[PDB]
RNA sequence: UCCGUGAUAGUUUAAUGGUCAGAAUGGGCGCUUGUCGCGUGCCAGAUCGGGGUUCAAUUCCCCGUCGCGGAGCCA
RNA sequence: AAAAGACUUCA
RNA sequence: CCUCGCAAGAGGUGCACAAUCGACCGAUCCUGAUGUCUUCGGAUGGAUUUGAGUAAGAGCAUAGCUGUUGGGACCCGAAAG
RNA sequence: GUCGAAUUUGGGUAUAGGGGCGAAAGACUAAUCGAACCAUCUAGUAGCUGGUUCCUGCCGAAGUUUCCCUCAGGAUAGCAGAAGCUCCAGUUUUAUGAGGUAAAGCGAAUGAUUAGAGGUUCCGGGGUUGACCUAUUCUCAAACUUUAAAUAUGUAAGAUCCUUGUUACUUAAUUGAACGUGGACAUUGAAGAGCUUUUAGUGGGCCAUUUUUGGUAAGCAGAACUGGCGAUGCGGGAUGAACCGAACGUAGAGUUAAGGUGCCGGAAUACACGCUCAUCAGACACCACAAAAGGUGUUAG
RNA sequence: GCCCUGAAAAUGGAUGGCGCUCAAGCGUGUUACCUAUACUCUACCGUCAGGGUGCCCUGACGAGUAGGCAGG
RNA sequence: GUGAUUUCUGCCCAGUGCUCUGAAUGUCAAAGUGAAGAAAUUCAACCAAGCGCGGGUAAACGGCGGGAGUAACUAUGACU
RNA sequence: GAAGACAUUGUCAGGUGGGGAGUUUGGCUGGGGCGGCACAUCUGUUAAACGAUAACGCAGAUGUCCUAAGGGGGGCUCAUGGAGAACAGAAAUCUCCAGUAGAACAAAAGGGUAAAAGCCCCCUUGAUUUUGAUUUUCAGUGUGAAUACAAACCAUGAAAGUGUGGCCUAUCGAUCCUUUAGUCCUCGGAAUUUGAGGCUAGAGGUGCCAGAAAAGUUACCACAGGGAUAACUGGCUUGUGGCAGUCAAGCGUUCAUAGCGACAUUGCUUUUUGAUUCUUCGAUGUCGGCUCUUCCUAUCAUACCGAAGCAGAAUUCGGUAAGGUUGGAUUGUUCACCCACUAAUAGGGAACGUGAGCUGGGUUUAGACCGUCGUGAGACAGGUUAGUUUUACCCUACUGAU
RNA sequence: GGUUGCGGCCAUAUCUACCAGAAAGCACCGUUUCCCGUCCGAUCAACUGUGUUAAGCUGGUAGAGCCUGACCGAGUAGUGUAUGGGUGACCAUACGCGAAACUCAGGUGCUGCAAUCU
């Protein structure tokens, strides 16, 4: 999708830094296990039959695209800040990368 | 061609429409040529100029325009021969006609849906000819005045808007037009 | 249903300027600052890109209520409905033009106003108008209570 | 008639990422072989007509012409 | 223990 | 209202009411004194959105009545499960 | 039709409700069967149809907009009313910018006719010239979408001052205004009208006029601007929701509108004149028809 | 203009009807009449202005379904 | 499932269906053993029948086509 | 007797699972399906408008791409068409002149701009966090969007300033739960750990886009209703369809008009077909046929007539004119084909005249077969066999009688 | 007679012959070693003068472009308002308004502040 490089300098929201500093940019997938969730309700509702409200999520609509899915993490303080909405696929990372120009060829 | 009298066309329908983006594949201009006779001749040899002018506000069919103009031309070119005098059509045919084109019986009515529904499929060209507008402007010599007048009579039974033959004045007459050299 | 509602639609005549107005606008107009209580027309210049009002607001006259940084705050009234409120618009100075009509109006009343003063001293033009204006009035004068009185008829009961 | 679906050398059909087009057969070219043919080396397209966008269009839109499938109700 | 077909001319 | 002049009226003085303004009390958000100095409890001050307090100060009780939800809920009407 | 067999049938008698029962048709299970019947749950629930019972007064509708598994309904503004609170509305004229649509300009451009006239590019003949096709350039008939100037026309918003002191302010320790206060000074219209609580019927419209947009058209479809009908009587029009006059407590007298005056039928067989002789023809609008072509020596001009 | 010609339809003739034709046609002017719940006026019922002493008076406005309210 | 007889009942296991063996390889639950660990919670040894990965299967539901070129006349087209 | 820590029973886990059960199964829409987008949202016209403005109205885009396609400043000014340069045509290329918005500006449309917002070179990250006055949303109603700030922080830049995402007009996701972020609050004797609950923010699906967990059939049907909506009859219209008029190109050996007659064009009718959605959904009996009646004129025959390319004579065309118009075969057929007749065997209307008269063959229930389609149920304007005709006349109308 | 700083109105200043701010109130050329542009001092970034009016700014002078007006076109096209006629469509009528060309004219700029002059 779009190259943003993983290591950048940008402003940190936190009160401890309060200046432009290094951040590492990352996608954040899913997490649960603890069970003190929606999961708890489900266990309770699925016994016998139903499940009820667990039932939503899927079958599919489909869609095509997501929007941007990010943490920018300070490495000075190890505090971080989140970002506001943008439209992204997907996202392109690599721990560096240009999109550069250049030339010639190609 | 395909019947519809001109009950369908003659009264002044439609916010025009003939705009170039909005209609691929119009049926043709069938008018053979607009100027006729001595095309290789200036206006100024001819001492007589006769006109044909409308009483009504209409849309004239392309076929009626060619049929009236050819009927006039056969009378001119038979009596005055091939290298006669000179004629110009005042009004070219460029207003575009929509009509919906003959359904089906599939019980398929309009199969569309129920419908109809803009984007009607073009039937050809017409000309606006408004009140007092001039369909033909013909340049001639007085010893063939009669011939152009019967050609203009044989033209009238081939368009539906009622029109009158007339002798022109414009600028000048033809001789206040000529004294500066 | 169908199509859009939309800010940019129906602008082609309003947005567009004359052959004579065409070309870049002059920065003098951009530079101009105004005072509160000035009367200004709003009609956007086509030749400025940004700062533009909703398109629907052009040709209205408003009074500069206050300013907050580069753009200015204009009071105008729209129309139609129930208990319609007066609106604040953030509209730039490039798009805002003076109004001559009140300026000459102000000079004429004031020019007149001097002619009278001399007549009040030694002269009797009038007389009836003289009787309310000495008995009459403070407000101080110049207040925000008179604004709702005006505001109240703008939602018109009959039209409705 | 609507909505779907196509078309590339003599012919049937592969193919693309916007910058690059093939195969197979059929044919024309020799050699085989008594002589033809099979075989074996050699050879060669305005990508349906059309207009448009772009840097660059076989490739991306828009239309027609033709050949296809699929509908078709209560009279 | 065999790859391989036609055939087509002058008393 | 009074001070007035009186068939008008203004200037003072007190303010319902509404519009306009500020200012405060909590919440947040941010500097944080005095300082204690393991610990940290909290003056000052501002910006904010919201909620509260003063000239935006008052009910509660039963009553007859209206509306709303309800319960069958103005009445009846169905194949139904 | 069958009639000696998978025959016919009497008695006693098995199998009971998504079960039975079937040589299976969804046939049959006591007049009830794509799921018996009885009773109960039940006064099911029904954006659906129907109905909802005394008088009077003052005011008096909406059929619209957003949302909505939403379009036969809700919801919320939109449109009405009561009950009170408190004591301003409009309009020419001035100024602004804007519909539009006709002839130019740009862009597109069907699309002719085209003289004059520089230059393409090919070959092909002859004595640099000079036949041959394309094509600038000044130059000519009307259409269409921008724009001038639009012309228009509805619109369509818009109708206190000074001094004194004190404070602020954004912007060089720099220049200014403009803020806020505190105090003093001096200035054609008429109730059409402000605010609040609560309430209801929608949340399906219709016709005409004007301006349209689709549709051959339509007692069509779908907008705009307005009046009426709905919810508006009475008088006119043969009848007749929305055509004209007219907005209606009662009762009377007078006089009128619209429109009419031979009779039906008030009220003229009115007055000056002219055409028409077909029974044209007794008709604003209207399910009132009548055209192209119109002759024409009918009359007239 | 007129008029005929264009001008053909289904249970029975009409311009509402009879049906007059220097008009009872149609057009140009024009005189007099007729005619609504309109308009004016008389009397008087409600509302609202209001006044005045449970009551009297002045003048204006005043159809009505859904529907609100109020008196009976 | 089909339908006296009588002559006969061809090809197709790709999909679907069903099934067969699976002592070994990727998926495949629980208890269950192990790891961190106070707990549990995370994760990881181990696989049954099932998916896979392979064979059978039409008197199992069913299925049994698409453009050309081409006769020493033309039409057709044995054949490429 | 067999067998045996199994098996069978108790319990649980995975797999299969329409047998059974409960349910759902998209809106608009000139009938609903079918087809599609006009489900969210922007345009240029519609649009008469300040603003707000419809139709499956026109034409036409968006559901991405992008750390450069952001920012700022310095420095330059186009597309281009002519000329010029061996080769090169596509020929860049480079050069010179002339060159004001016709170029460029990622992307619709249209608008808009010349030391520019365009083009280039460098430098850079402010595509930052916080709060958002207000408008658009929408006149009061959210998300979203935008235009302005002030705090916090930096950039470039000379600096003023600019910079609150993308040339301009503005480019989309609530809600539980999850995730993650902040520094902080919190979980009932004390006390110590874990993991909970929570503060403000961002991200994970809902394009049925101001937000549901979700397929069909019914011809076995059933119910509530609707002429708010179809088939229908009637009506409107009259494209179509029938017929006519004008004009008369042309053909008829020659000759417009004996006859035939295009293109074009105006009409008329309402009897085909469509269109509509006015009427009827507490019910208008369907086609067709039979039989009985009354009619129409656009007349097929008969009467009277005109013209002729009328010698007779069969004839052709046409005027006036409404006082008969077979019987059969095939088919349900209307229609039509077809046969012999005839003077000639016309066409049209009367609710496609005609079911309180008949018929019942077709359409059009319930059973069944075949082709075709559909996983299936079951469906086809596909074909086929079988498959019902209620009522005692009050009024009116009239034959007849009194 | 005003050249020029800085502007404003920004088509009355777009374009193409040729006369003028000028012996100490320009532009040019020359140092282009260099801060500076590079790919060349051209661009530019800098330091300066043989002198030259040729261009430059701008002033002097002529046409197509254009605004503004007068003149017909003469209230014409069109138009809200009320209504008569026409078979239809369509038209007119009074009430208020009023564009297109034509030819002629004005202007090849204006206006203000300062560097302020021989």
Short mmCIF file of N, CA, C and O (backbone and C1' of nucleotides) in Angstrom, two decimals, chain K residues 86-103:
data_model
loop_
_atom_site.label_atom_id
_atom_site.label_comp_id
_atom_site.label_asym_id
_atom_site.label_seq_id
_atom_site.Cartn_x
_atom_site.Cartn_y
_atom_site.Cartn_z
P G K 86 -62.19 33.48 -32.39
"O5'" G K 86 -61.13 32.66 -33.23
"C5'" G K 86 -60.22 33.19 -34.20
"C4'" G K 86 -59.02 32.25 -34.44
"C3'" G K 86 -59.31 30.76 -34.28
"O3'" G K 86 -59.89 30.30 -35.50
"C1'" G K 86 -57.26 31.26 -33.04
P U K 87 -61.18 29.39 -35.43
"O5'" U K 87 -60.63 28.10 -34.73
"C5'" U K 87 -61.52 27.27 -33.98
"C4'" U K 87 -60.90 25.88 -33.84
"C3'" U K 87 -59.58 25.86 -33.07
"O3'" U K 87 -59.85 25.89 -31.66
"C1'" U K 87 -59.23 24.66 -34.98
P G K 88 -58.76 26.57 -30.72
"O5'" G K 88 -57.46 25.67 -30.94
"C5'" G K 88 -57.44 24.42 -30.25
"C4'" G K 88 -56.28 23.51 -30.68
"C3'" G K 88 -54.86 24.05 -30.45
"O3'" G K 88 -54.40 23.61 -29.18
"C1'" G K 88 -55.02 23.46 -32.66
P A K 89 -54.08 24.62 -28.01
"O5'" A K 89 -52.63 25.13 -28.40
"C5'" A K 89 -51.54 24.22 -28.16
"C4'" A K 89 -50.45 24.33 -29.22
"C3'" A K 89 -49.82 25.72 -29.39
"O3'" A K 89 -48.88 25.93 -28.34
"C1'" A K 89 -50.41 24.91 -31.60
P C K 90 -47.70 26.98 -28.31
"O5'" C K 90 -48.22 28.12 -29.27
"C5'" C K 90 -47.46 28.51 -30.42
"C4'" C K 90 -48.28 29.40 -31.35
"C3'" C K 90 -48.54 30.81 -30.85
"O3'" C K 90 -47.41 31.68 -31.03
"C1'" C K 90 -50.64 29.98 -31.46
P C K 91 -47.31 32.86 -29.95
"O5'" C K 91 -48.04 34.09 -30.62
"C5'" C K 91 -48.22 34.34 -32.01
"C4'" C K 91 -49.40 35.29 -32.23
"C3'" C K 91 -49.45 36.53 -31.32
"O3'" C K 91 -48.61 37.55 -31.86
"C1'" C K 91 -51.54 35.47 -31.22
P A K 92 -48.03 38.68 -30.91
"O5'" A K 92 -49.23 39.65 -30.57
"C5'" A K 92 -49.79 40.54 -31.55
"C4'" A K 92 -51.20 40.98 -31.14
"C3'" A K 92 -51.23 41.85 -29.88
"O3'" A K 92 -50.88 43.17 -30.22
"C1'" A K 92 -52.80 40.12 -29.62
P U K 93 -50.95 44.66 -29.76
"O5'" U K 93 -52.02 44.94 -28.65
"C5'" U K 93 -53.42 45.13 -28.84
"C4'" U K 93 -54.16 45.13 -27.50
"C3'" U K 93 -53.23 45.73 -26.44
"O3'" U K 93 -53.41 47.12 -26.65
"C1'" U K 93 -54.18 43.75 -25.59
P A K 94 -52.48 48.36 -26.42
"O5'" A K 94 -52.54 48.74 -24.90
"C5'" A K 94 -53.60 49.57 -24.41
"C4'" A K 94 -53.78 49.23 -22.94
"C3'" A K 94 -52.52 49.40 -22.10
"O3'" A K 94 -52.47 50.76 -21.74
"C1'" A K 94 -53.41 47.32 -21.56
P C K 95 -51.51 51.57 -20.82
"O5'" C K 95 -51.03 50.74 -19.57
"C5'" C K 95 -51.75 50.60 -18.33
"C4'" C K 95 -50.92 49.94 -17.23
"C3'" C K 95 -49.44 50.14 -17.50
"O3'" C K 95 -49.09 51.43 -17.03
"C1'" C K 95 -49.79 47.86 -16.94
P G K 96 -47.87 52.12 -17.74
"O5'" G K 96 -46.55 51.61 -17.06
"C5'" G K 96 -46.24 51.60 -15.68
"C4'" G K 96 -45.22 50.49 -15.38
"C3'" G K 96 -43.80 50.50 -15.90
"O3'" G K 96 -42.99 51.34 -15.07
"C1'" G K 96 -44.73 48.33 -16.07
P C K 97 -41.81 52.11 -15.80
"O5'" C K 97 -40.82 50.90 -15.96
"C5'" C K 97 -39.94 50.80 -17.07
"C4'" C K 97 -39.39 49.39 -17.11
"C3'" C K 97 -38.34 49.18 -18.17
"O3'" C K 97 -37.09 49.69 -17.68
"C1'" C K 97 -39.75 47.26 -18.25
P G K 98 -36.18 50.60 -18.60
"O5'" G K 98 -35.81 49.62 -19.78
"C5'" G K 98 -34.81 48.61 -19.52
"C4'" G K 98 -34.87 47.53 -20.59
"C3'" G K 98 -34.35 47.93 -21.95
"O3'" G K 98 -32.99 47.60 -21.98
"C1'" G K 98 -36.34 46.71 -22.26
P A K 99 -31.80 48.29 -22.70
"O5'" A K 99 -31.56 47.12 -23.73
"C5'" A K 99 -30.28 46.81 -24.25
"C4'" A K 99 -30.04 45.29 -24.38
"C3'" A K 99 -29.29 44.87 -25.62
"O3'" A K 99 -27.89 45.19 -25.47
"C1'" A K 99 -31.06 43.22 -25.29
P A K 100 -27.28 45.99 -26.71
"O5'" A K 100 -27.41 44.90 -27.84
"C5'" A K 100 -26.89 43.58 -27.59
"C4'" A K 100 -27.08 42.76 -28.84
"C3'" A K 100 -26.45 43.01 -30.20
"O3'" A K 100 -25.04 42.99 -30.32
"C1'" A K 100 -28.65 42.20 -30.60
P A K 101 -24.01 44.07 -29.85
"O5'" A K 101 -24.09 44.70 -31.23
"C5'" A K 101 -23.64 45.47 -32.28
"C4'" A K 101 -23.99 44.65 -33.53
"C3'" A K 101 -23.63 45.33 -34.86
"O3'" A K 101 -22.27 45.15 -35.26
"C1'" A K 101 -25.91 44.53 -34.96
P C K 102 -21.88 45.60 -36.75
"O5'" C K 102 -22.87 46.82 -37.07
"C5'" C K 102 -23.52 46.91 -38.35
"C4'" C K 102 -24.02 48.33 -38.67
"C3'" C K 102 -23.04 49.48 -38.38
"O3'" C K 102 -22.14 49.59 -39.47
"C1'" C K 102 -25.11 50.37 -37.51
P U K 103 -20.59 49.80 -39.40
"O5'" U K 103 -20.49 51.36 -39.53
"C5'" U K 103 -20.99 52.15 -40.60
"C4'" U K 103 -21.30 53.56 -40.07
"C3'" U K 103 -20.29 54.16 -39.09
"O3'" U K 103 -19.22 54.77 -39.82
"C1'" U K 103 -22.38 54.39 -37.97
#
